[PDB]
Each structure stands twice: as structure tokens, then as C-alpha cells.
Design an enzyme around this catalytic site. Structure first.
Site, short mmCIF file in Angstrom:
data_model
loop_
_atom_site.label_atom_id
_atom_site.label_comp_id
_atom_site.label_asym_id
_atom_site.label_seq_id
_atom_site.Cartn_x
_atom_site.Cartn_y
_atom_site.Cartn_z
N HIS A 103 0.85 -1.20 0.00
CA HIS A 103 0.00 0.00 0.00
C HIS A 103 0.88 1.25 0.00
O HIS A 103 0.69 2.13 -0.82
CB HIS A 103 -0.94 0.00 1.22
CG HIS A 103 -1.92 1.15 1.27
ND1 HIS A 103 -3.22 1.04 0.83
CD2 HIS A 103 -1.79 2.41 1.75
CE1 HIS A 103 -3.85 2.19 1.02
NE2 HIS A 103 -3.00 3.04 1.57
N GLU A 104 1.87 1.31 0.90
CA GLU A 104 2.72 2.49 1.03
C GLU A 104 3.66 2.65 -0.18
O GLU A 104 3.95 3.77 -0.60
CB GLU A 104 3.52 2.45 2.34
CG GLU A 104 2.66 2.29 3.61
CD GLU A 104 1.50 3.29 3.72
OE1 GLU A 104 1.56 4.39 3.13
OE2 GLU A 104 0.52 2.96 4.41
N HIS A 140 1.75 4.73 -2.71
CA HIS A 140 1.84 6.17 -2.47
C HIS A 140 3.24 6.68 -2.87
O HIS A 140 3.37 7.71 -3.54
CB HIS A 140 1.62 6.48 -0.98
CG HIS A 140 0.20 6.38 -0.52
ND1 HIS A 140 -0.85 6.99 -1.17
CD2 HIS A 140 -0.35 5.74 0.55
CE1 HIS A 140 -1.98 6.74 -0.53
NE2 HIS A 140 -1.70 5.99 0.52
N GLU A 185 -4.83 7.97 -2.99
CA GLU A 185 -5.29 6.68 -2.48
C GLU A 185 -5.60 5.65 -3.59
O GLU A 185 -5.50 4.43 -3.38
CB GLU A 185 -6.47 6.88 -1.53
CG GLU A 185 -6.94 5.64 -0.79
CD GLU A 185 -5.98 5.19 0.31
OE1 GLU A 185 -4.90 5.79 0.46
OE2 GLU A 185 -6.32 4.22 1.03
CO LIG Z 1 -3.14 5.18 1.84
#
Ligand SMILES: [Co+2]
Ligand SMILES: [Co+2]
Lengths: 489, 489
Positions: free
Chosen positions: B253-254, B257, B283
Site C-alpha cells: 500500500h505504502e 503512495h 489513495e
Molecule cells: Co493510503
């Protein structure tokens, strides 16, 4: 004046940010982030400087009406710093600042090859600016006294020279007696895993009662202490697989600095009186803990059983053997590796050179030959190349002149502080018992609690009743190294 | 105008410092350093704000003469941001800022006990300020539209409501078919040592080609991504011994980003056009990588043999079993733990509540009962206490309203982006081969290269040819969860 205090406390927040930016740079920062990090740091530093040399602060300084004795010192110190730095034309600040970073980064590349020519032009430039800087700060006796004053306020190069000479003479006498003796085998000359080294450094910090609620230990290329913020004073060490003494004594050295920073009164935080008294005094604290405590038999008696457990390989050695082995004397090329007998010779050499550089009596071009000549004169060594010679330390290549002598003064202060401590306290019993709060309390009451309220010369008299001199050191070295090497003197 | 660019690039340096201060706070900062760190952060943030709403910047914005199309966007975006924030009376900024930190720190204490009363007064205060803040920013349709606009520019609550309703209806239909089925045993429900988990997360980051010259991985209490500076974008994860999926998917997830931040053009750095297009779009990138790539069978086929080696305990499972097991659907109290089917129901609930809060149609006092009622309505759950209920997330207790809906939009954007990607690329072959540069290049050219030049609605059309809607998501979930659970729809 609450208003004066607030102004300083606001600027200190930017210093805090800069301090974290420096800490991270040396510890966690990714490789490619460097050039931009350098720009952030420069920007924040330059803004903080603007704030600290700004008319509004002068106006606050000139209008504040001290109520207590501490307020008086604050303005007094505040004024002296302000008017000194006001005189700095922002051109000269930025011109030095960028020249420094560029000398710094060039040095990194040229050093492994001892290529003096790749760094020469920027170095002769930074020395020129320094000399102009020294002229427009003003000085007594010597241009160099201007720069020296920034690290050791009120100290003059002539006094430094007089103390250094006596110190040097005593050191060659001592070195000559020690060198006649056959060396024993070095018990620490062996591989000890980093995990075991970390375990021991962490044990040491708990035994010394490092406040881990207000700091932490990490690794960096070059061990240091960074007071980042209120209740945030961090230290780094370095693990060398085949010399655990490096991590042990780096850790304890930095503990010494950290303890000083943490023990300055909270009410002083962010104020001009809120730092250590001088670089010499700060280094006296690291050296006190690292060497006077850390390399004493008394300290070793208390850590011996724990060390032996962690490093079963060295079970076969007595505590007295281990104690002697952290006190091995040896003339070596590298200052940061030098034992406490030869160490000050390294500082003298750098003192002589940078003084002449700043007083215009020596050119940058002649530095390598001069370095080599003095290493031959004082340490009896033939410097083979510049990597082991004059490019070994970063100080000059960051533009810091007047810094080096304070390392030696730190050793001198530590010995004199220690002689005073011994009049009030059974040092050996306290230290072998691990009861360090007794020592911390003395250092807090005598030293740490004063912050920068006093100039070092006044501070050393307050603490010990005498001006700084070499006699305490001479006595310290005579007594200790006679026991270490089992010979007279 | 170079002069406009410099002004922004100078302010960005203070943002960089603030970003590092936040990063360190969550990772390495010692416990007692917190209150002062909070003061440094507040000071630097408030200074950066002053600079960014200052007359000199307005003057630069009004005098700059764009030369190229990019310059035009820059001023356009620069102007809109400037005039919006100029209107903010510095009283209101600091009043919200301190109220936030105080609500934040109180929440920490009251949360383990679900004590709504300890946080109630500050929360009703922060909501009041927010409503005033919304009035003096101005709005169309709804006061809430003002705050929503800060996180998702140009998005209106009415459109969000329409998309959410359709999304909700589809989700209950899906949930009902899935819930009839007996669950299989969870193969990941077992202890896997943190060292093995770290090994795998680091392997994953190398397989995904995280640029470790421009970032690093660390741990924190709550996984996040922090763009600290040029070439410095850091990510954190969290290791839960009995659910390796937490660290796996947090890390990925990170990464998502981080990739976005790193791939915005270097020339945009520090400029108003230099960030992501919106929170929803940021997101969409984390969710794309975490879920669309990370929870796909195609991704698992490529990581299977490495995972199995690192975790020999799970050798007995097929890749298809592992794939299904990272896609287990379950109604649960906790938003951050929710699967991609139930997740958006959590956001809807928070959307409904904060909208009514800001539009003055619901009191802070009624929040707990309302939360519980909506968890019962949408998720069919009986919230036992406030710890698992309305105090579970920090957003509101930091004063952030209008943030929550962008998590759901992120899921919607990701599905639509993915449908477009699939027209140009054999996704399954690319992903199972580990050839992610093909995907990175698409996302860079279509999305990352645009920074904040465009508002999200315009950006989604540019990327996919359509406005944002729920159809891509519906198709994504229907197709995927039919395969996961082996049933129609
Ligand atoms: Co996020
Ligand atoms: Co030191």
C-alpha cells in the site's frame, strides 16, 4: 523579560529542526537525498541566523530590564553574541557557507586518493574568508584569537601555546619510558560479533543510566552527540568487528556529551545561556566519562563480569589485563585512534598549523609538507600520503578553524575537574560500585547547572579554585600510566 | 517567472523540515521528546503558512507572466490556493491548530476506555471552528462542500452521495451471496516471526523495485508514506506476528503512495502543481498496488515460490489457496482491517456522519449513537463500546473532516484506472512475470506526470475518457469475487 525569552525560544525551534535534519542526514537519510537535504539545512540555518542578528532582537536586548541575577547573565551573554554577529555581512555568511559545503563534498572524493590538489583551491579560499572574518570580528594579539574565541570564549592562542609546550615536553618524556618496554599481546585484537557489541553498548548505557526516555543510540560513520530538542539528546556509535573498544569508548564518550546537554537547567533551554560553557568544557565531559571513568581499573572491576558473560571468548583474561589493554599507548597516524598519552600531540600539530594559516604565516599550499614535518617532529612518524596525513580530519574542509585546540583543553579540564572531584568523593569506590549519581550530582552542581552563564576561565576557577593548567593532567598521566605499565613515570 | 518558482521552492524547504519532524516523531523520537517536538512542528508549520499567504506571494502571483502551458497551470493553481487561504484569519488557524493537538492527545488517553466524555468538549469545539472555517472559505450547495474540496478539489457531497448509494446497494447484494458459504480455514492464521516477515517485505520491495536510493522502510504504529524531500520518500509498515498479511499489504500500500510521489516531474518539486491531484487520486495509487495488483492471483503466482521458501510452514498450500486467503471477506468493526468488499461501507458511515456534523444537522453528543446505528444498518453489527466504535480512527480527533470520503473514491478511481490499463496491456501476463515497469510507465504517463496540474474530474477523464463512477468498481468486484468464492456474483 518574557518577551526576550520568547524570541530566543522561537529561534531555538528552528535550531531544533536543523539539528534533526543533521542527525537524520548522518543516520537514516537515503543516498540520493543528500543534495536537497543540504539545501534545506542551509536555508533553515540562514533563516535562524537572520533572526538572531535582527534589529528586533537588538531592540529587545537593549530594552529588557533584568529582574534576577540569571536574567542579567542572559542579557549580558545575549548582547555579546548579538553585537558580534550583527557585524557579519550576509554576503560573507553565505559565501563561507556554500564554500564550506563545496569544500566538504570535494574532500570526500579526494581523500581516499590523498589528492590535495582537488581540494586546494577551495581550502585556500575558505582560509582567506576566515582571515577576513577574523578581521571584521576584531581581535587582541592575533587574528587567530578571533576564531579561537568562537569555540573557547576568552581563550588566547598565547596561553594555549604555553600550556601546549609544557604538555608536549612531559609527553615526550613519558613516551620514551613507555616505548622501551616490550608490548604484551592485545587481548581485544579479535573478532567480536556486532550483535554482542550492541548488547554490551546497550548494557553500558543502562549501567550508566542513559535516559532512554530522552535520547537513543544509533550508528553513524562518525560517532557524535546531537542535542535535538528539549528531552531529546541522541548519540551514535560505530561497531568495528575486530575492535570492540571502538564501540565501547565511542558510546561512553557520547554519553558524556549527552549527560551535559540533558543536565543544563530546563529553564535555560533555547536561551543564550542554555548551552555548554565552551567546546573545551563540553569535551571535558565526554573525556571525563570516556577516559577518567571509562578507562579506569575501578570502572572495569564493575563491568568485568558482565563483559565476560557477553564475550565468553575473553573469560581467560583478568580484569587487570583488560584494564591495561584499553590503555595501550602507541604513536599512530590517526588522531581519532590515539591513546590519551599521544593524543594531545595530534592537537598541537593542528594548532600550530591552523594558527599560522589564519595569521597568514603559512600558505595552504605548504600544509601537506608542514603536517608531515610536524608529525615527524612530535610523533616521530613518516607520513606516507595525505589520506593518513593532512586530509584525515574534516574540520578544515568544513571551514572550522579554532576548533582543534579545544580537544586538548578538554583533556586538561577533565584532569583538573577530576582532581577536584577526588577531594569530595572516594572515586574508586563509587565507580567500582556503579554508583554514578554521586558523580553526576557533582558535575551537575559544579558544571552542568551553569550552562553558558560563565566564560570557561571563570567557570574553571569556580569549579576547581584555579585557572586551567597542565599540572592536573601531568599528575593524572604520571599516576595512571605508571600503574598501567608498572614503571616509574 | 523564476522568481515565483524560487519563492515556492524556499517555502517547500520548511515543508521538508516539517515532514522530517513528523516522520521522526512516528519512528525514532524518544517518548519524553513529544511535547517539544509538537511545538517545533507547530512553529514551522505556522511560519510556512504565513509565507504561503503573504502579500509578497500574491504580488508575485499577480505579476508573473507565464511563458509556457505549465507556467499557466502553475499560476492558475497558485492563485486559487493563495486567495483561498489569504481569507484565513491567523487567529482561526492557530485556534484550530492548538485545538487539534489537544483533541489529538486527549483522544489517545480516552480511546482505550471508550470514554467519549473526555474528548467530547474539544470535539464539539473543533466542529464549530470547522463550520466557521467552511463559512469563510465559501461553498456551493453545502457547508461540507468547502471542507471536502480541500481533499478532493471540485468534488461535491451530492455526487459523492449518489455514487455511494449505488456502491452500497451493490455491496449488500454481494455480501449476502458471499455470507451463505461456509468459510475455509485461514492458512495465514499462524505465527510467522518478525524476522521472516521483514525478509519478505524487503524482498517484495525489491521485486517491485522500490528505489532504496530515494527512500527507506521503517516501522511505526500506523503505516504511512512521507514524502520528505526531493529523492526522499519514506514508507513504514507494521509487523503482526500472527498475520503476515498486515505487513505484506501495508508495505505494498505504502509503496503505491511512494511511487506516485517519486514519479511526479522533478521540475514540479516544491511547486503548487508538484503534489498528487487529490487525496482520492493518491489513495487510488496505493489501492491499485495493494489490492488490484497485490491481491491478484497473477501477482501471487510470481511471489509464491519466494514466499514459500521464506515461510516453509506454508509450503502445503497452493498458490490459489494463498490468493483466496488474502481475499477473505468479513464484516468487522475496524475500518483499517476491512476487506475490499466491506471497506467502503465503513467510509459511507463516516461520510454520512461528518457531513451532517459540518452541515449542523447532527450534534457531537449524538455521534456515538449515530455511529452505532449506522454500523447496525450497513454492516449489521452491534457496536459494544466506543473503542471499537466511533473513537477507532484519529481523523476527527485531529480535526480532519472531508478526508474520509476520499478513501472510497480511491477505491473507485483504482478500478476505473485498472479498466483503462487493461485495454493497452495484458495485465495478468505482465504482473505474473514481475514486469512492473510497463505498469509504472502507464501510471507515470497518464497520472504521475500531471502532478496537480488538473482537478481530479478533469484528470479522470484525461486518463480514462469518462467521469468517475461506480461501474468499473462493480465490474471489478463481480469478476474478482466470483472467482475468489467460486459462485455467480
Ligand atoms: Co493510503
Ligand atoms: Co567529543
Amino acid at each position: 523579560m518574557e518577551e526576550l525569552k520568547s524570541y530566543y525560544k522561537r529561534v531555538a525551534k528552528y535550531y531544533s529542526a536543523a539539528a534533526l535534519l543533521y542527525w537524520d542526514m548522518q543516520t537514516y537519510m537515503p543516498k540520493d537525498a543528500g543534495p536537497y537535504r543540504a539545501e534545506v539545512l542551509s536555508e533553515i540555518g540562514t533563516y535562524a541566523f537572520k533572526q538572531i542578528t535582527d534589529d528586533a532582537l537588538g531592540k529587545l536586548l537593549e530594552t529588557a530590564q533584568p529582574q534576577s541575577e540569571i536574567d542579567e547573565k542572559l542579557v549580558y551573554v545575549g548582547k555579546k553574541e548579538y553585537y558580534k554577529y550583527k557585524k557579519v555581512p550576509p554576503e560573507l555568511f553565505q559565501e563561507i557557507m556554500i564554500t564550506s559545503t563545496m569544500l566538504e563534498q570535494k574532500w570526500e572524493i579526494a581523500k581516499p586518493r590523498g589528492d590535495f590538489e582537488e581540494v586546494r583551491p577551495l581550502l585556500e579560499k575558505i582560509v582567506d574568508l576566515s582571515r577576513k572574518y577574523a578581521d571584521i570580528l576584531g581581535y587582541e594579539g592575533e587574528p587567530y584569537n578571533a576564531l579561537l574565541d568562537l569555540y573557547e570564549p576568552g581563550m588566547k592562542a598565547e596561553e594555549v601555546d604555553q600550556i601546549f609546550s609544557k604538555v608536549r615536553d612531559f609527553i615526550v618524556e613519558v613516551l620514551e619510558k613507555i616505548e622501551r618496554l616490550p608490548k604484551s599481546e592485545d587481548p581485544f585484537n579479535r573478532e567480536i560479533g556486532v550483535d554482542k557489541q550492541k548488547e554490551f553498548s546497550n548494557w553500558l548505557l543502562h549501567y550508566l543510566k542513559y535516559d532512554f526516555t530522552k535520547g537513543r543510540l544509533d550508528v553513524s560513520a562518525h560517532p557524535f552527540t546531537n542535542p535535538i530538542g528539549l528531552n531529546d539528546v541522541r548519540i551514535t556509535t560505530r561497531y568495528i568487528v575486530n575492535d570492540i573498544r571502538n564501540s565501547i569508548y565511542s558510546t561512553i564518550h557520547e554519553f558524556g556529551h549527552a549527560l551535559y546537554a540533558l543536565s543544563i537547567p530546563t529553564e535555560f533551554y533555547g536561551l543564550p545561556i542554555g548551552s555548554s560553557a565552551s567546546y573545551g568544557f563540553d569535551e571535558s565531559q565526554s573525556r571525563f566519562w570516556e577516559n577518567v571513568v571509562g578507562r579506569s581499573l575501578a570502572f572495569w572491576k564493575g563491568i568485568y563480569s558482565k563483559f565476560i558473560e557477553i564475550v565468553p571468548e575473553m573469560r581467560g583474561y583478568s580484569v587487570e589485563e583488560l584494564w591495561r589493554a584499553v590503555n595501550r599507548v602507541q604513536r599512530s597516524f590517526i588522531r581519532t585512534e590515539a591513546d590519551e598519552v599521544t593524543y594531545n600531540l595530534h592537537i598541537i600539530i593542528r594548532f600550530e598549523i591552523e594558527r599560522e594559516l589564519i595569521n597568514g604565516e603559512l600558505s595552504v599550499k605548504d600544509v601537506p609538507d608542514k603536517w608531515n614535518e610536524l608529525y615527524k617532529k612530535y610523533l616521530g612518524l613518516d607520513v606516507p600520503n595525505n589520506t593518513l596525513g593532512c586530509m584525515q580530519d574534516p574540520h578544515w574542509f568544513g571551514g572550522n578553524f579554532g576548533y582543534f585546540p579545544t580537544y586538548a583543553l578538554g583533556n586538561l579540564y577533565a584532569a583538573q575537574i577530576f582532581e577536584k572531584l577526588k577531594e569530595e568523593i572516594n572515586f574508586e569506590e563509587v565507580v567500582s560500585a556503579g554508583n554514578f549519581e554521586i558523580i553526576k550530582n557533582f558535575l551537575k552542581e559544579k558544571i552542568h547547572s551553569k550552562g553558558k552563564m560563565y566564560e570557561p576561565s571563570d567557570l574553571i576557577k569556580i569549579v576547581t579554585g584555579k585557572p586551567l593548567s597542565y599540572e592536573s593532567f601531568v599528575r593524572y598521566i604520571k599516576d595512571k600510566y605508571s600503574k598501567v605499565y608498572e614503571i616509574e613515570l
